[PDB]
Design an enzyme around this catalytic site. Structure first.
Site, short mmCIF file in Angstrom:
data_model
loop_
_atom_site.label_atom_id
_atom_site.label_comp_id
_atom_site.label_asym_id
_atom_site.label_seq_id
_atom_site.Cartn_x
_atom_site.Cartn_y
_atom_site.Cartn_z
N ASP A 58 -1.01 -7.89 0.92
CA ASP A 58 -0.46 -6.54 0.93
C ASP A 58 1.07 -6.55 0.97
O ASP A 58 1.70 -5.76 1.67
CB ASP A 58 -1.03 -5.75 2.12
CG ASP A 58 -1.02 -4.25 1.89
OD1 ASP A 58 -0.23 -3.77 1.06
OD2 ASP A 58 -1.82 -3.55 2.55
N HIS A 114 0.80 -1.22 0.00
CA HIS A 114 0.00 0.00 0.00
C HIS A 114 0.84 1.27 0.00
O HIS A 114 0.28 2.36 -0.19
CB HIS A 114 -0.92 0.02 1.22
CG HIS A 114 -0.20 0.11 2.53
ND1 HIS A 114 0.88 -0.69 2.84
CD2 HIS A 114 -0.39 0.91 3.60
CE1 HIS A 114 1.31 -0.39 4.05
NE2 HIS A 114 0.56 0.58 4.53
N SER A 150 5.84 2.65 8.90
CA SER A 150 5.60 1.27 8.50
C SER A 150 6.84 0.67 7.85
O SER A 150 7.71 1.37 7.33
CB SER A 150 4.41 1.18 7.55
OG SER A 150 4.67 1.88 6.35
#
Lengths: 151, 47, 48
Positions: free
Chosen positions: A51, A29, A103
């Site tokens: 993902d 993402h 992240s």
């Protein structure tokens, strides 16, 4: 120190890519391109079930790879911003630690072996629960608590 | 002429669906670090 | 002439026999392909 890389899009840092085992991993993402010139030219395969994206590591960079493991006994584990607690099948972080935009960071064992890659978390008063990507023998899974929001 | 075209279409659909199934069957094993695909799938099914 | 004309459904027995065989063989190949797709899609969904 050397095994983590920065991802930039229009001068802004959005995330990190980690070099574990024999593959280069990145959350799917996150937009942008990889800073390192050589890695930017590789072709990646995507899967919206998990993902994740992966590829094969080129040869002359092999000395920089980290190790990995698959046993997860109960105890204490470490990451960049402090300690993390694993009990009952969940990852626990004292609230307020962590903000969006962080992240792609690995979680390390006691000997420094990589065990999980974190993408997002849920909100609760005293302690917070995370959504991670882990693995086992020959498969990959995704653990997601109720109400989690992407970082 | 019309019947011949239709029969060629139906056989084409059979090949396409087998291609789609191969991708979803093998995709998980290509993302686990340090994993090795089992022999049976490696050669016979989702080859 | 002293008889009526013919319609689309009036064909020889041998010609009708060949039509069944060719149509059936194609239909079998599609059905087996569809069976493979359903099992793989179902087992993938429940495993996660």
């Amino acid at each position: 120190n050397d095994c983590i890389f920065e991802v930039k899009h229009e001068g802004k840092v959005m995330g990190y890519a980690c070099l574990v085992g024999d593959k280069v991993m990145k959350p799917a993402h996150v937009k942008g391109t990889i800073d390192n010139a050589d890695l930017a030219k590789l072709a990646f395969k995507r899967s919206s079930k998990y993902d994740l994206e992966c590829a094969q590591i080129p040869v002359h960079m092999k000395s920089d790879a980290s190790k990995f493991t698959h046993e997860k006994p109960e105890g204490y584990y470490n990451w960049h911003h402090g300690a993390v607690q694993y009990s009952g099948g969940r990852f626990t972080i004292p609230t307020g630690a962590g903000k969006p935009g962080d992240s792609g960071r690995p979680i390390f064992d006691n000997k420094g072996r990589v065990v999980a890659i974190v993408l997002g978390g849920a909100n609760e008063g005293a302690r917070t629960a995370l959504s991670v990507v882990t693995w086992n023998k020959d498969i990959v899974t995704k653990i997601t608590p109720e109400g989690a929001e992407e970082w | 002429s019309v019947a011949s075209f239709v029969l060629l279409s139906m056989v084409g659909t059979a090949v396409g669906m087998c291609v789609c199934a191969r991708r979803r069957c093998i995709t998980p094993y290509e993302l686990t670090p340090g994993a090795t695909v089992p022999f049976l799938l490696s050669l016979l099914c989702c080859v | 002439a002293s008889h009526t004309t013919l319609g689309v459904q009036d064909i020889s027995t041998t010609a009708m026999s060949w039509v069944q065989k060719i149509t059936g063989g194609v239909g079998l190949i599609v059905a087996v392909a569809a069976l493979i797709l359903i099992v793989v899609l179902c087992v993938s969904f429940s495993r996660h």
